[PDB]
Amino acid sequence: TYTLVWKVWILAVTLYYAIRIPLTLVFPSLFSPLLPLDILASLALIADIPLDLAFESRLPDLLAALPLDLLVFALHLPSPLSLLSLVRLLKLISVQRSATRILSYRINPALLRLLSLVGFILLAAHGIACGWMSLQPPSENPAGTRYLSAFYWTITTLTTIGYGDITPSTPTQTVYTIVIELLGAAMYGLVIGNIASLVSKLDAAKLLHRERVERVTAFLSYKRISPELQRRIIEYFDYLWETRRGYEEREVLKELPHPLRLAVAMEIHGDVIEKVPLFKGAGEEFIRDIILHLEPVIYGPGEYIIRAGEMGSDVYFINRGSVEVLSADEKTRYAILSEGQFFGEMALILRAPRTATVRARAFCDLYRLDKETFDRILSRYPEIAAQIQELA
Amino acid sequence: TYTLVWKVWILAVTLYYAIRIPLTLVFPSLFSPLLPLDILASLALIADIPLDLAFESRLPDLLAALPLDLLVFALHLPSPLSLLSLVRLLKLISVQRSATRILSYRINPALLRLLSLVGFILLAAHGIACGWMSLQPPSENPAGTRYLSAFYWTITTLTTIGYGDITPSTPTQTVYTIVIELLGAAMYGLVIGNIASLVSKLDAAKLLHRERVERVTAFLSYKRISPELQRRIIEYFDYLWETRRGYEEREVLKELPHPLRLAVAMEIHGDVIEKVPLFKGAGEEFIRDIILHLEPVIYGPGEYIIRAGEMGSDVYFINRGSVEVLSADEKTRYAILSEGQFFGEMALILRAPRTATVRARAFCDLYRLDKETFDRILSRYPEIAAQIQELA
Amino acid sequence: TYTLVWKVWILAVTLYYAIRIPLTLVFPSLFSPLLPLDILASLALIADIPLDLAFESRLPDLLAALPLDLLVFALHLPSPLSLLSLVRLLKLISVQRSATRILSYRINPALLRLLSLVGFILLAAHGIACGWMSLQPPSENPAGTRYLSAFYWTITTLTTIGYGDITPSTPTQTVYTIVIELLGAAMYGLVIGNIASLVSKLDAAKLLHRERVERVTAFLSYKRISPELQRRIIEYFDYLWETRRGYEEREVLKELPHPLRLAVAMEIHGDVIEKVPLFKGAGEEFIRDIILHLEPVIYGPGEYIIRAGEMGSDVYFINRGSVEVLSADEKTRYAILSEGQFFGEMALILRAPRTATVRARAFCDLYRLDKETFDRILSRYPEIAAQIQELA
Amino acid sequence: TYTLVWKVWILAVTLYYAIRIPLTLVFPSLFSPLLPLDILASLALIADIPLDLAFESRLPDLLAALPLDLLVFALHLPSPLSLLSLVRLLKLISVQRSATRILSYRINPALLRLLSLVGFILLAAHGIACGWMSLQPPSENPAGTRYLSAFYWTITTLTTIGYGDITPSTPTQTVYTIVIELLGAAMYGLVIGNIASLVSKLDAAKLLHRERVERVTAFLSYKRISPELQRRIIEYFDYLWETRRGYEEREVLKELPHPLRLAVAMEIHGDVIEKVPLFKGAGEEFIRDIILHLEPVIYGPGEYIIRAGEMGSDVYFINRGSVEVLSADEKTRYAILSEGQFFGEMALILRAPRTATVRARAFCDLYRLDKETFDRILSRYPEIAAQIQELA
């Protein structure tokens, strides 16, 4: 648990270094007023290099633990060597790899890469502004105003906006600008590429649904299906979207392993299958064999699940719809059936013609079991198969 | 129904606020000439917060209903606090979520996101222009000309074009520009990412088709198939594109649930299967069992559906092609067969050698049923199985 | 055939109008020197509106046929109305839809969209340069130099480079720039999005192959498979790439319809199956049933296709590899087998132990048939089944 | 082997030409001091055109072998013709196609395209800077300073930053800028598109995993599954990610050919199946038939692999988990079982009720074989089937 607060402290420490090391390379007159925080931060980096072994390519941590900043600043070394103070910022590599561990289970990896990159671009912009100030001719301006002009220039460059009111006056500023321009083009390319990768996946389920609906309606239009049916199909896909988000129950349950697929099947059907009179008191092992072989099917409003006088072979279990059971002439209603009720169960005991028509009222999802799948499983429970056989 | 006109009115009301609140923060001398519209608009937002509960994270609506604009303007509060007038614009969140409900069934979600973003960028540009004008030194210029210069500057920034003829002259303008530059880079990154996501999916079916055609022609070239066959295959894929858009009938019908797959099968085959002499007067339940087991197959021009003297096992149903039936020597024509006609039906009653050759004329899509699949289904209709058995 | 040359002429005619109409709106002193070409071009557009019905939302063609250009120019109408000359450019819509018909079978649709867009951007840039010149103060400069400055400005804007050496001096130029900046951001966003969509699909087969190789090597590393096997697997995937481009023969043949899948099977196996002694003189219908049930399998170098003394059940057909047949002790070579040769064929006639070991030399692709699949098909050819039965 | 060093030398030679040919077109006073390297480089290109035939659209190599550079420079030809020296740079086409051969097995093709493009953009920038210098008015500035200003201008243009402090002063510079602006927009579009294609695929496995987890949790929420189960499912997917990276063992083994799928099955199960008492001393052919039909299944912590008193049909093989075997009342522990141990093996010899309950301790992956799959394979090994039959 508390290691999260520690890695947030080490984030705050490396963020502190990423914002003071380049700034104190430009303004040494800031080094010592923040030396208490510097000692604390350096001791914190030293405290992290062993502690990173608790609840765990470690060279960036090893280098950032080394206090070359305190060395070059306290001894006032010349600038070309004083840049070795920047080894603290190697901790940003470790902290980015810490971020892709301590919040990658919670935050979308495309967006986490974007926030990590935007953070790096703001820290880079800060460092790049300090590089600009370092190359600028010495002048009597307030430190914040020269920094603001440098940060303005770098953001002008990195965003590729390029006003041109601040530009190189000297060769080394020009070389530096060439580098920071290429770096800004790369950074803004990474920003655009991250945002493209993120947006390309924001509604992937909805676009995948839309392209199945087009495939089905393009094909059906080629088959010259009537507008009434091609609407009972569009309305079905609208239902499947607004209920499930377009996913097939068959395809989703196949992406679960058998014990969890069984647990989900028990959670969905466990009460409704126990209350079938034909199964009353039969063993849990047999009920388990039923529920793993129940096939889902969706019926549209007004569609005939069962007619009358056809032989038939299936028993049905309402799960979210509702259903009307009707005389063979469809003139009179015998029942309304709702969630957790079943019909056609006589088809298990005898393959004989249907006594009543049955029609979905609203969109109606329900489960199906057939005398073939049923006989298959009863082949391995003779003790119940005999009961079914003698009931006829 | 009429709730659409209401949410279009609330769109017009929040669009009004998104274009007057920031403008009246710059020009208070516009506040009262539009106070009638302001009262009407505020009453409209108040009217929407309860009415949003009719045919339905509501904090943006709750905040935008609060008339902090009338408060800060009518009492002429200082600018740092007067920005609280902007709470009206929180209604844009509710109105964007209304748009992704009231036209997301009609318009492609990638393009709807793009139009929503472009709208936000134009409203943001307006607000950002007003922020620029607010930071500009007071001067005697017409209100429209200073606004035009500010809108020019913001579009120059947001599009990342950055001419530099308008640029910061002061620190607060510079900080503001840094912010608006980062915001413009982000906004233009969102625009490019939206357009990338949209274009990446404009011809997805055609590129998916092209990559199956390459897979098949790459593999066939590895197998050193003759150029004549690798053309009867390319011509088939061109046919499959220009008729169906490359979709397999098997794969499309599997993305329908059983009652609709049955209804589509009835719509395609229901007349042609009823007029088979062997099935004349057989029950609808049996015809349903036929049509669910008909397998589609496409024959290329000149290809032999049936030769002569092979034993054979299948009956065929023309659906869109045409066919020539021919003597065993292929010298003489017995028939031309077109949509809604069938041949080889003797293979159902007796597994005996074929009497006539049969060849597709144009590209020819047709359906296939075989003595194995047929016997399977007749195993569950003995009353017809006996008729078939005694006909031999 | 020749309609291609006609639509290329109509391309040249609409390209002519897209480059003269906006230019003559700026320089009327060019209208009449090109009036012969104008009459020819207008007659050509009039000639196309009926001829578009030969070998075929027609409003763009209908509008572009109307000679409002000859009307507004020859009568020297004021500029706000003279813009109606631009109706010729509506033909670009028809010509883009002609391009996505007359070369979309040949050119990748992502790249065809890119070339169509780049063409539109160059034509738009031309028109936008003319709009700039129209808004420019009247001055004594050569027509080409003012055009070059305007085309420089527009390309500076559209590419979002934005030097700022040419910028608005007046309100209408500023409004126009705001529009052309938003249009340039949109156009360059379309360019980047097109290029992103194109590059995202340049090596799709190779990246799909790479991600199966990673899935297999990640999983195998989790299973702690030895480095020697995880190399016989990487070498297999390198072979499968450099021969086939990573495609499974099973998956490719399933994307062909039965008559073409049969024709491909005949082309691959038709000679090698005819020369099996057990099948010599058996009917083509039976050979067809063999070749549709041959299963491909790849053997790596040095791998044992057959050992000795195991019972075995399969006959094998070399298709591209080579094989060594070896004594049961592996000490002595009986044969080298190459493309179009077969082994283990005794497994069809009798399920008895293998007499010789067999090992792939190089990577070796070959086909497999087994006594189970063989018996299945012989169940429907008793006339050959008896011959096989009595041969033992 | 050593051909790698040669193609790296030819890379260094074409890189030399890509950086001297355009530079010596601007500064002829550099031609002869580097003539030794020029002769060596030209001889190297001549040496490569035959040697490219060793361990192998050759027009770029043929043209680059021709020494038109030595011709135009040593004879001091006028600039419009002297540009023919650039034919050396056609070797970059050959060297890019060499790079996509000699490191495309090692480096991701999306990133290899990016590095190849960035290299081309830096070489193009160099050439474009030389074109700028060529069009610049003659002046007394050091060669490096004028080059630095030209390279600054080109990078300013290509990155689309466009400061505008260096801009055209003449018509030919303006035309050249228009071209280089369009080229820079195209190049930076290719950079952004490459980076988009690369980032879109950086965590493809993790986003594919996330979208199955959403599909399963969206569907389960629609089915109103309890939060306790929808957590035993999320915890399972977290386990499947952190162990395997979300891949199904079934789907991965199906992407191997039979001999390697067998070798992997032998590597995973070969010791644990040999040590089953029922299989002790049975032939390798039969063990091979077992291991190809073992089905993997993952059990979550605390889940019941076996209860007691159910009939049961399966034997299980622990592969990475651990398991507790428990009395029928679950009060007492009989065993802890770990990797390479098996249980329930009595289900092979007799389909009789289970004697002890069995529960996964941690997340537990293990393999399953059932009396049905077992009987199927024993149907083809009567010599062992008799032993199993008589053991009861």
Q: Please, what is the end-to-end C-alpha distance for chain C in angstroms?
A: 64
Q: Please, what is the end-to-end C-alpha distance for chain B in angstroms?
A: 64
Chain B stretch 20-49, residues whose beta carbon is closer than 8 A to a beta carbon of chain C: none
Give the whole-angstrom CA distance, residue B51 versus residue B65: 12
- Asked if A192 reaches chain C (Cβ–Cβ under 8 Å), the answer is yes
Q: What is the number of other CB atoms lying within 10 angstroms of the CB of residue D15? A: 15
Cβ-Cβ contacts under 8 Å, A160 against chain C: 160
The reply to whether residue C160 touches residue A160, judged by beta carbons under 8 angstroms, is yes
Give the whole-angstrom CA distance, residue A30 versus residue A209: 59
A357: enclosing H helix or E strand: strand A357-360
Contacts of A362 (CB under 8 A, 6+ apart): A301, A321, A322
φ and ψ of D390, to 5 deg? -80, -10
Give the whole-angstrom CA distance, residue B178 versus residue B183: 9
The reply to whether residue B164 touches residue A165, judged by beta carbons under 8 angstroms, is yes
Cβ-Cβ contacts under 8 Å, D161 against chain A: 157, 160-162, 181, 184-185
Hey, of B159, B192, B199, which one would you mutate to test binding to chain D, going by the most D CBs within 10 A of its CB? B192
- Asked if A202 reaches chain D (Cβ–Cβ under 8 Å), the answer is no
Is D311 flagged in the annotation as binding?
no
- Asked if B162 reaches chain D (Cβ–Cβ under 8 Å), the answer is yes
Residue B70's alpha-carbon distances to B37, B80, B293, in angstroms, are 12, 16, 71
A254's tokens: 């196949």
Chains with at least 3 CB pairs less than 8 angstroms from chain B = A, C, D
State the virtual CA torsion across A255, A261, A264, A269 in degrees, nearest 10.
120
The β-bridge partners of C315 are: C369
The reply to whether residue A165 touches residue B167, judged by beta carbons under 8 angstroms, is yes
Contacts of A360 (CB under 8 A, 6+ apart): A299, A300, A301, A302, A303, A305, A321, A322, A323
The reply to whether residue B163 touches residue D163, judged by beta carbons under 8 angstroms, is no
Residues in chain B: 392
Give the whole-angstrom CA distance, residue C209 versus residue C215: 10
* Helix, coil or strand: residue B139: coil
Is D355 flagged in the annotation as binding?
yes
D313's tokens: 């049909």
Quote the strand ranges of D104-166, DSSP E: none
Nearest-by-CA chain D residue for A263 = D229
Q: What is the number of other CB atoms lying within 10 angstroms of the CB of residue D54? A: 8
A204's tokens: 């992937």
C264: enclosing H helix or E strand: helix C258-274
- Asked if C375 reaches chain B (Cβ–Cβ under 8 Å), the answer is no
Hey, of A107, A108, A182, A190, which one would you mutate to test binding to chain D, going by the most D CBs within 10 A of its CB? A182
The reply to whether residue A268 touches residue D160, judged by beta carbons under 8 angstroms, is no
Closest Cα of chain D to A383: distance in Å? 12
Place of tokens 């340069």: C129
Angle in degrees, CA D324, D326, D332, rounded to 5: 115
* Helix, coil or strand: residue B343: strand
Q: Determination method here?
A: cryo-EM
- Report the candidate in C214, B67, C103, B133 with the shortest Cα–Cα distance to residue D204: C214
The amino acid at residue B148 is L
Going edge to edge, which strands form the sheet with A314-318? A295-299, A364-370, A314-318, A342-343
Q: With both helix axes pointing from N to C terminus, report the angle between D109-135 and C204-222 in degrees, rounded to the nearest 10.
A: 140
- Report the candidate in B387, B305, B316, B313 with the shortest Cα–Cα distance to residue B350: B313
How many interface pairs between C and D have CB atoms less than 8 angstroms apart?
A: 140
Contacts of A184 (CB under 8 A, 6+ apart): A154, A157, A158, A159, A160, D159, D161
Residue B116's alpha-carbon distances to A202, B23, B190, in angstroms, are 15, 22, 11
A190's tokens: 């990474």
Instruction: Note the resolution in Å, 1 decimal.
Output: 2.7
φ and ψ of B367, to 5 deg? -120, 155
Confirm if D83 and D103 have CB atoms less than 8 A apart.
no
Cβ-Cβ contacts under 8 Å, B159 against chain C: 160, 181-182, 184-185
* D56-92 per-residue burial string, b: 16 or more CB within 10 A, e: under 16: eeeebbebbbbbbbbebbeeeeeeeebbebbbbbbbb
Of the partner residues D162, D192, D196, the one whose CB lies closest to the CB of residue B162: D162
- Report the candidate in C36, C109, C93, C96 with the shortest Cα–Cα distance to residue C70: C36
Confirm if C181 and C157 have CB atoms less than 8 A apart.
yes
Angle in degrees, CA D113, D116, D119, rounded to 5: 150
φ and ψ of C36, to 5 deg? -55, -45
Quote the strand ranges of chain C, DSSP E: 295-299, 304-306, 314-318, 323-326, 333-337, 342-343, 357-360, 364-370
The reply to whether residue C167 touches residue B165, judged by beta carbons under 8 angstroms, is yes
DSSP conformation letters of A148-191: HHHHHHHHHHHTT----SS---SHHHHHHHHHHHHHHHHHHHHH
The amino acid at residue A375 is D
B139's tokens: 């001067």
State the virtual CA torsion across A18, A22, A24, A26 in degrees, nearest 10.
-160
D375's tokens: 């009987």
Give the whole-angstrom CA distance, residue D105 versus residue D128: 33
Contacts of D191 (CB under 8 A, 6+ apart): A185, A186, A189, D114, D117, D118, D121
Give the whole-angstrom CA distance, residue D252 versus residue D267: 15
Is B145 flagged in the annotation as binding?
no
Is A312 flagged in the annotation as binding?
no
- Report the candidate in A308, A390, A288, A305 with the shortest Cα–Cα distance to residue A349: A390
Give the whole-angstrom CA distance, residue D22 versus residue D83: 8
- Asked if A156 reaches chain B (Cβ–Cβ under 8 Å), the answer is yes
C358's tokens: 């067999």
